[PDB]
Each structure stands twice: as structure tokens, then as C-alpha cells.
């Protein structure tokens, strides 16, 4: 079987010097240098991988359209659906209870 | 190495030019005492200084 060599001056098997083995139209077997695999965008609240967002190396996000990088919702590309659902319910219930804690501290300012 | 600096590569160019034999028309000058270039350098024998 044909054996290959690196295509750059780096002779070491580092994380940024990873290669794939590819067969060329010339029937040869040469090394093709691969870029590091991209990591998935993750939720800032729960840490899970966000759905609907492309997995790219960070600079490649600048040259892609916005629909690839977001989801049509509040906190679209930042928080997950369940974390947004919990934010909405928590905001509504706590602010509703804020009214309850206020009116009670006015009923006791005329009887106590 | 293949990867060398400009400062290094410029010194290696001068070392080649200083390694020439004596031009033969110099021995014909009147009262000439130089018979040969006394500052020859072989790569394997004497090392430079880079």
C-alpha cells in the first residue's frame, strides 16, 4: 500500500496538524490536511447543544447568513426552549407574587 | 534549516562570495605577493558562526 508524508513543515501529530488519506484522480494516495472538528453551540443556562444552529469554527460564523445562527424566538441563539419556557413562567409568577407581597403589606398598615 | 532568517541568509551569501579562488590576473600585478586565496572555507571542515 502507498504511504504518505506531511505537506507542511510541521512533522508532529498535533491537534492542528491532523491529516486525512485521500485518493487522487491520478490514482495516487496523498495527505490532505484537515481543520479541527467544530464543536456545537451550547445553552448558556443548561449547557446542552442548541438545535437549529450550524456547527462551525468560530470565524466561519461571520461569513454565513443569520438564519443559520439563530432560532425565531426570544433569546434565540442563546438559550434553549425549555430554559426560555422556564424564564417566561418564572417571570410571570414571581412578578404576580410581587403584587401579593405588596397588597398584604398595605392591609397590615391600617389594622396592625 | 530550510526555515532561516534574512539576517542568517545574508551572511551565508557573503560566505559563498568569500570562498572564491584567487582571480588569476591578480598574480600579474607588479610587486604582487598574493599567490592564492588564503581564506578558503569548506562547509564540512570549518564551520561558520551563525
Amino acid at each position: 500500500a502507498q504511504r504518505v508524508t506531511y505537506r507542511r513543515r510541521n512533522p508532529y501529530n498535533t491537534r492542528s496538524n491532523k491529516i486525512k488519506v485521500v485518493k487522487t484522480p491520478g490514482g495516487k494516495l496523498v495527505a490532505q490536511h484537515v481543520k479541527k472538528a467544530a464543536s456545537r453551540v451550547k445553552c448558556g443556562d443548561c449547557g446542552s447543544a442548541l438545535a437549529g444552529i450550524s456547527t462551525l469554527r468560530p470565524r466561519q460564523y461571520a461569513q454565513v447568513s443569520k438564519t443559520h445562527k439563530t432560532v425565531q424566538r426570544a433569546y434565540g441563539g442563546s438559550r434553549c426552549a425549555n430554559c426560555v419556557k422556564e424564564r417566561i413562567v418564572r417571570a410571570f409568577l414571581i412578578e404576580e407574587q410581587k403584587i401579593v407581597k405588596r397588597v398584604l403589606k398595605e392591609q397590615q398598615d391600617k389594622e396592625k | 534549516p530550510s526555515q532561516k532568517s534574512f539576517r542568517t541568509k545574508q551572511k551565508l551569501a557573503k560566505a559563498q562570495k568569500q570562498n572564491r579562488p584567487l582571480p588569476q590576473w591578480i598574480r600579474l600585478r607588479t610587486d604582487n605577493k598574493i599567490r592564492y586565496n588564503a581564506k578558503r572555507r569548506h562547509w564540512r571542515r570549518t564551520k561558520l558562526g551563525i
Binding site: - | 539576517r7 551572511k11 558562526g49 551563525i50
Partner: protein, 86 residues
């Protein structure tokens, strides 16, 4: 194996060319010249090494400016140009 086998592991230059004196005495990690003391303002020189002063002193280079001070002084530091005689 402290001799010949250990002498095979010499491929990391401690010194490189100095910008002031060009001598290969510039300690790479120390960023100092062991010969002329660069980048210190003063030149490295010692009275216990008088032969080292001989090697680098006035007259060992070109003296591209001190060459002519004697000849300009001898004429009283003329200003102007020489006048052709009639």
C-alpha cells in the same frame, strides 16, 4: 555516557548574532551580549582584560569620522572654500 554520547545533544544555540557587534555572543534567553554588553548604553570593557580592549577600540574599525579631525584641525577648522590663485 557523559562524553561523546552527551556531546551529540548540542543543537540549541545559547547565543546568536549581536546587533551591536555581530559576534554571536547575544545570549538568547538572557537577551544580553556577553561581549559588548548590548543593549546596555555603555560598552562592556574591563581593565583585567587589556587584550580585549585592543580587539575593540578606536582604530580597530574605520574611524570614518575621526580620520579627518586632525586634518580639519590643522587648518584651524576652515569654513568656506579654497580660492584659486590668479
Amino acid at each position: 555516557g557523559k562524553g561523546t554520547p552527551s556531546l551529540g545533544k548540542r543543537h540549541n544555540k545559547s547565543h546568536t548574532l549581536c546587533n551591536r557587534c555581530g559576534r554571536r555572543s547575544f545570549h538568547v534567553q538572557k537577551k544580553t551580549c556577553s561581549s559588548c554588553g548590548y543593549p546596555a548604553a555603555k560598552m562592556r570593557s574591563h581593565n583585567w582584560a587589556l587584550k580585549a580592549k585592543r580587539r575593540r577600540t578606536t582604530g580597530t574599525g574605520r574611524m570614518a569620522y575621526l580620520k579627518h579631525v586632525t586634518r580639519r584641525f590643522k587648518n584651524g577648522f576652515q569654513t568656506g572654500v579654497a580660492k584659486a590663485q590668479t
